[PDB]
Design a protein around this ligand. Structure first.
Ligand SMILES: Cc1[nH]c(-c2cccc(N)c2)c2c1C(=O)CCCC2
Length: 129
């Protein structure tokens, strides 16, 4: 059931974004960076597509993800901004790498990746039909 499936992976995404918020070090990605208060004034000169857990929660609450991959793309964007801005040996970069690993392993345990595969196959059915 295509609508039933949409409900399923929305529930998985909500559970996963919550697990990230509570994983060790998750708080530094919960909200968009306040550049002046965190002593990083150049942050938005470098990061032109900012993203945080709270942004993703808002898009989930508003039904703004159409496909399972779009949620993963937004979470991955957090980790890419983290590794771009912070040097590889910094606490923040290490923390971001650790949470990234967790997220990708949750995609496996929760079976979220199966929904991304079904999303691609449906897109191929439609392209034939
Ligand atoms: C995504 C990110 N979060 C936080 C942060 C936020 C709240 C408290 C603390 N302690 C750190 C940072 C960050 C960066 O990569 C840019 C450098 C600033 C640090």
């Amino acid at each position: 059931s295509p609508e039933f499936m949409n409900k399923q992976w929305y529930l998985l995404a909500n559970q996963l974004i919550l697990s990230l918020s509570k994983y060790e070090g998750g708080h530094i990605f919960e909200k968009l960076v306040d550049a002046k208060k965190q002593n990083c004034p150049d942050y938005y000169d470098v990061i032109k597509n900012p993203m945080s857990f709270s942004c993703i929660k808002t898009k989930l609450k508003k039904g703004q993800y159409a496909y399972p991959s779009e949620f993963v793309k937004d979470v991955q964007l957090i980790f890419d901004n983290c590794s771009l801005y912070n040097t590889s040996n910094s606490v923040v970069a290490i923390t971001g790498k650790n949470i990234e690993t967790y997220f990708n392993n949750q995609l496996i345990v929760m079976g979220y990746n199966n929904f991304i595969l079904k999303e691609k196959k449906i897109n191929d059915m439609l392209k034939l039909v």
